Every structure is written in C-alpha cells, then in structure tokens.
Write a protein that binds this ligand. Structure first.
Ligand code: FAD
Ligand code: NAP
Ligand code: FMN
Length: 613
C-alpha cells in the first residue's frame, strides 16, 4: 500500500485549508466527509476528502503551516471496537507515535450503533487521542447512532459545527446555496465497445479475464453450483447456495465472511430511465471538475447509465437529505420543491416528513420520482448523487477442511410491504435467488473477508454455539469441521448447538444435515427451540437457562468457548444476560461480578459474537 505524498503539501498547492478523512467500509463515513468537504466552500474555505490509508497522518504536524487549517475525522467502528480497515494505519499510528501536534485544530464525528457495547470506539479514540498529542479541539465529538438515525445525528451536528468553525476563525457564511457540480458529463459516440465498462469493479475486463489474487477490488466470478430452498414452509424463503471457487487460490476458514457484488432489478432500472425520459443506453463518463483529485470518476468509466444504475449505484435505499436537497431544483411544482428542500432540516416538520415519508416508508428513488412527478432531474446529475452500491456479506456456511473448493451461503431472502405503498426487495438476496446452477453459467462476483470468529485451536475445547435462524450459518461450517477432525482421529471435546426457528416444518434449517451430525455424534447436543409451536415463545435462551448446571461446568471448568451469531438488538442481548445469570447463580456472585466475568471471557477470547440488525 504505497502512500500518497504529504497531504498537507497537496492542500497548499491546491489552495485547500480543511481536509476530511473518512474511515469506513460501506461508504457512509465517506459520504459525510464529501458533504463536509463540499460544505467548506460555502463558508469561504476550501476543503477535500481523503482516505487515510493513502496517506501518512504523521503530517498532521505540518498542517499548522496552513492558515485557518483544520482536520476533520469521520470515523466508524467495527468488530471489537476496531477501526475500519482503511483506518487501521491511522489507528496503529496514534497508538505508537509521540509526535507533537501543537497548533493543529480538529473535529471528529463518529458513526456507531447503540446495540454494540463499544459505541463509537474509534470516534471516541481519535478525538481523545489527538488531544493527548497536542492538537486543539475546535468542536465537540459527534456520536452518531445508526440504531436510531445516524443521518439526522449527522445533520444536527453538521449544522452546529460550521458556525463554531466560522466563529473560531472569523469567516462568513457567504450567501450559501446555488448548486455546484462535482463531475462533468461527457457523452461518447465512437467509443470502441471493447473499452466500455460493463459492471466490472476493478480493471477494465477483469470480470472476463480472471486473474488472482481476488479481492474486493478484483472479485472472483464464482459459479453457482447449488441453490436450494432450505425452508419447508412457505412463510419466507431461506436458501442454501454453493459457490465454486476452484482455481481462485482463495483461502478461508469457517467463521469468515464472503461478499458479493449484486445487480439491481432490471425492471427497477428500466423505470428510473423511462420515468426520466432518458436513453439509458448512452455511453458517457463523469470526470471530476477538479483535475487534481484522484477520484477521476464517480464510478468506473466510460460506461452506460443502465450499467451504472444496474451495478454501480444504490437505487433502492432511502435517499439521504443532501441528495434530496440537490434534487429540489428539478421539481417544477413548488409544493414539491419545498418538501425536497426541507428534507435536510435539523428540526421542524421538514425533519418529520423526511423521517416518516422517506425513511420510515422506505421510499427509494423511483418511488420518490413517482410521488413527486414534478421532479424530473437530468439523468447525468442523478448518477453523481446516488451513493455507490455495496457488496453484501455472508457468514460462510461451509468448512475449509471439507469444502476447500467451495463457499456455502445460508441466507433469508428479503421482501416486504413497505409503508411507501410498494414492495421492496433485497438487492443481493433477490439476485442470488435468481441464480440457476445452469454466457451460460450462473456466476456470482464474490470474494472472502477474514474474520475473528474461529473454532478453538485446541480440538478438545468445548464449543457452545447459539445461532437461531440464519445465525446457524457460520456454525454449519463449525460442525462440519469438528465432524472432520473426529474422522481424523483428533480428540474432540463437547460440541453443542443452540439453534432456533419458528416451527420444525417452516424454517428448521438443515433439519436433515443437523440430524446426521447429531446421530453420528458430531453434535454432543442439538437443543433446538421452536418459537411458535406453542402459545408461549421458546427462544434459545430458555434452553441455555435450562442447562445452566452443565454449561457452567464447561465454561468454568472445561474452558469452553461460547459462540453467538444472529440478531443483535435482542437475541444476543437476551442470551448475554442468561449467561450473566448462569455465572451469577453457579458462581456464585452478584450480577456485577458476573457481568464482568462474562465480559472477561469475551476479551479473553472465549466468547465470540457476530451479530447485526
Ligand atoms: C458480518 C455480516 C454477516 C452476515 N451474514 C448473513 C448471513 O449469514 N445470512 C443472511 O441472510 N444475511 C447475512 N447478513 C446480512 C446480509 O449482508 C444482507 O444484508 C441481507 O442478505 C440482505 O441484503 P439485500 O441486499 O438483499 O437487501 P437490501 O436491499 O440491502 O435491503 C436490506 C435492508 O432493508 C431494510 N429492511 C429489511 N426488512 C425490512 C422490513 N420488513 N421493513 C422495512 N425495512 C426492511 C433494512 O434497512 C435492511 O438493512 C450479514 C451482514 C454482515 C454485516
Ligand atoms: N450479523 C450476523 O452475522 C447475522 C447472522 C444471522 C442473522 N442476523 C440478523 O438477525 C435478524 C433476523 O435473522 P433471521 O431471519 O435469520 O432470524 P429469524 O428467522 O427472524 O428468527 C429466528 C428465531 O429467533 C427467534 N427470536 C425472535 N426474537 C428472539 C429473542 N429475543 N431471543 C431468541 N430468539 C428470538 C424467532 O422467533 P419468533 O420470530 O417467533 O419470535 C425464531 O425462532 C436480521 O435483522 C439479520 O440482520 C445477523
Ligand atoms: C459487522 C458490523 C460491525 C459493527 N461493529 C460496531 C461496533 O463495534 N461499534 C459501533 O459503535 N458500531 C458498530 N457497527 C455499526 C457501524 O459503525 C455503523 O453502521 C457505521 O454507520 C458504518 O459506517 P460505514 O458506512 O461508513 O462503513 C457495525 C456494523 C457492522 C455492519
């Protein structure tokens, strides 16, 4: 990872006084940065965004060489309160450096989520650390809560931030407003076909010419071997997929995640085009008007609107306030121009409307286009606004020791009645479902992501796995592997599964496979919880609570490892208590002593989580 030159120097040479580093994976932090960066301009200053992984943040000490200089960090938290991948260098650095940042003015906005225990560790860290080094805080730390509404949290913060800035430095709010574009449109007519991106993510033609290694930037088109329906009932659609990675040299261990780069719904794309009156089959490119930025285009180019809407753009999520504000200009009917503008208010009714009519109603772009017919923006400007389509992750359901040449996926297809009035569909799950094992084959641009979730190294350590619904996913690989080790002579301690589902004839995933593993003995216990076969709910905690005596015997004496995968707002929290209570009873020990004991197993590597909401 060859770093770029002193960003301070670039700022000097490009007349910029504020830089906004973004630490993110799904791009939300990146978005905020770009917004905060563009914002800078309307207040007499000029800023720029930047990936800290491309620079050496050691130069912060040089930043004071620029008048009215100030750095801003938009950081998100992951894993064990860990930084985003790209924010890793920055982190390790802040920890090891002793550098003096005297004269450095900063501000930090962190993206977190209250379900997790390490709420905005990064944000809190950077803010607090930069001070210890010497830099002076120009504005309070921002704690954005995604479980509530990060967007609004950002708004509220941003709104107070600029004035503070303006005041500390004595600068004007320079009239504000009047749309400013980032890219410039360039339509191509002669464009040699063989050089137009068709949905590749990295180098031109990387999808056709597959050359390792394969990473997020160079995914590996994997053939869909099997795509079966796992649920017996019809309430929902749960599926088991098997991606063939032969000849990819891609390594992986049960507990890792695999990511996919899906394609939006054809019909949904056609309509956006149609309702705008634009020819989606036009070949074009959006070159940055700043001939200095490294981000030459909003996405791969040259390409066609259809390709961008289909593979490069997120056209299904609720548009964020700034995208709607920018569009307000393209709505002829005033009534509508107003709502759109108002969408980015910090408070008032504008806020409530953006919160219920857009977010709560899950209204995506096309929906808003249909509901505000006077809104007919230019297709090229829309693409510059829409955010980038992300890859979806999946707990690899298989074990490397048994399926080295294949990755398995257990997923629940997303589909629901939105209050917007229509039916929304999960981008990747709908895409995945439509893959028929069968150019001709069914390929899925994927790539693996290593994780922390891992079976114990020592084959005799007791494993306790709590994974209701699709939470069982990673655990299918766990059991396969522990089954293997036994067929390999290896001595295997207890292996217990604590699974859950509605009814044994609705969503009892791997009812049969799990039946085998149990019969043969691979699974010491197979405690399953049918939450709907009786008046009262029977969740997995109840089972854990039921086996308190035994579990505590492997946790406290057998040094067993606890694994938790699935829902994070409830399932995980409820389970975590039950463990507090098991420890507190059989300890014995007050709640506090127990809560700690558990959290220790958590840090001492014996209690792993892998939840989301
Ligand atoms: C580390 C990790 C591991 C994961 N492992 C798995 C796994 O093993 N199996 C699996 O199925 N998924 C897993 N996921 C979730 C997975 O990545 C996808 O989010 C999921 O498959 C749906 O993606 P989609 O693109 O089809 O849906 P999208 O189009 O992206 O839509 C999903 C979004 O729609 C919204 N939504 C969903 N239902 C409703 C509703 N009823 N009403 C209103 N809004 C709603 C939510 O905001 C949700 O985030 C994992 C995620 C992470 C981060
Ligand atoms: N981050 C990850 O790695 C990961 C992996 C898998 C799933 N998930 C997340 O979990 C959510 C749902 O997953 P899912 O569809 O697969 O599960 P699910 O089908 O919705 O539910 C599975 C089982 O859990 C039960 N349940 C509901 N509330 C519970 C509680 N408080 N304690 C214990 N069991 C409870 C259900 O019963 P009832 O419905 O009848 O109440 C059912 O028996 C999604 O939001 C998804 O993001 C995250
Ligand atoms: C796998 C995963 C792990 C997360 N872990 C944490 C965490 O430990 N602490 C926290 O405060 N937020 C956590 N979050 C929430 C994110 O910090 C939040 O969604 C943020 O907006 C992500 O930023 P991005 O879009 O810029 O990548 C996690 C999200 C995911 C999907």
């Amino acid at each position: 990872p060859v770093k770029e030159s002193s960003f301070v120097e670039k700022m000097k040479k490009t007349g910029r006084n504020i830089i906004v580093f973004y630490g993110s994976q799904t791009g939300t932090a990146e978005e905020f940065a770009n917004r905060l960066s563009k914002d800078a301009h309307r207040y007499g200053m000029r800023g720029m965004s930047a990936d800290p992984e491309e620079y050496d943040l050691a130069d912060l000490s040089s930043l004071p060489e620029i008048d009215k200089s100030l750095v801003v960090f938009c950081m998100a938290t992951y894993g064990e309160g860990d930084p985003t991948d790209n924010a890793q260098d920055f982190y390790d650095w802040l920890q090891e450096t002793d550098v003096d940042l005297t004269g450095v003015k900063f501000a930090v906005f962190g993206l977190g989520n209250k379900t997790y225990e390490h709420f905005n560790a990064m944000g809190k860290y950077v803010d607090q650390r930069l001070e210890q080094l010497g830099a002076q805080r120009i504005f309070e730390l921002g704690l954005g809560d995604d479980d509530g509404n990060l967007e609004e949290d950002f708004i509220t913060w941003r709104e107070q931030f600029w004035p503070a800035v303006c005041e500390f430095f004595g600068v004007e709010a320079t009239g504000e407003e009047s749309s400013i574009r980032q890219y410039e449109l360039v339509v191509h007519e002669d464009m040699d076909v063989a050089k137009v991106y068709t949905g590749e993510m990295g180098r031109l033609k990387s999808y056709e010419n597959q050359k390792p290694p394969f990473d997020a930037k160079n995914p590996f088109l994997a053939a869909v071997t099997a795509n079966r329906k796992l649920n017996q009932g019809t309430e929902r659609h749960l599926m088991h997929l098997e991606l063939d990675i032969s000849d990819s040299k891609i390594r992986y261990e049960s507990g890792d995640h695999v990511a996919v780069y899906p394609a939006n719904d054809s019909a949904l794309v056609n309509q956006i085009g149609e309702i705008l009156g634009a020819d989606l089959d036009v070949i074009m490119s959006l070159n940055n008007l700043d001939e200095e930025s490294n981000k030459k285009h909003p996405f791969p180019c040259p390409t066609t609107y259809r390709t961008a809407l289909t593979y490069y753009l997120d056209i299904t999520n609720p548009p964020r306030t700034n995208v709607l504000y920018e569009l307000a200009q393209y709505a002829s009917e005033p009534s509508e121009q107003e709502h759109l503008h108002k969408m980015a208010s910090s408070s008032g009714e504008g806020k409530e409307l953006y919160l219920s009519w857009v977010v709560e109603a899950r209204r995506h772009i096309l929906a808003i286009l249909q509901d505000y017919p006077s809104l007919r923006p230019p297709i090229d400007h829309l693409c510059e606004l829409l955010p980038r389509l992300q890859a979806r992750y999946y707990s690899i359901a298989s074990s490397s020791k048994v399926h080295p040449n294949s990755v398995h996926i257990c997923a629940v297809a997303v589909e629901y009645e939105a209050k917007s009035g229509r039916v929304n569909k999960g981008v990747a799950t709908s895409w995945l479902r439509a893959k028929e094992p069968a150019g001709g084959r069914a390929l899925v641009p994927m790539f693996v992501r290593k994780s922390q979730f891992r079976l114990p190294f020592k084959s005799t350590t007791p494993v306790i796995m709590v994974g209701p619904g699709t939470g069982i996913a990673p655990f299918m690989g766990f059991i396969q592997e522990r089954a293997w080790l036994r067929e390999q002579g290896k001595e295997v301690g207890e292996t217990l599964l604590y699974y859950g589902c509605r009814r044994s004839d609705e969503d009892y995933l791997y009812r049969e496979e799990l039946a085998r593993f149990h019969k043969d003995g691979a699974l010491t216990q197979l405690n399953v919880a049918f939450s709907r076969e009786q008046a009262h709910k029977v969740y997995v905690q109840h089972l854990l609570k039921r086996d308190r005596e035994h579990l505590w015997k492997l946790i406290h004496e057998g040094g067993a490892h606890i694994y938790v995968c699935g829902d994070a707002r409830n399932m995980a929290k409820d389970v975590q208590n039950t463990f507090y209570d098991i420890v507190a009873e059989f300890g014995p020990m007050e709640h506090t002593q127990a809560v700690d004991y558990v959290k220790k197993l958590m840090t001492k590597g014996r209690y792993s989580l892998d939840v989301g909401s």
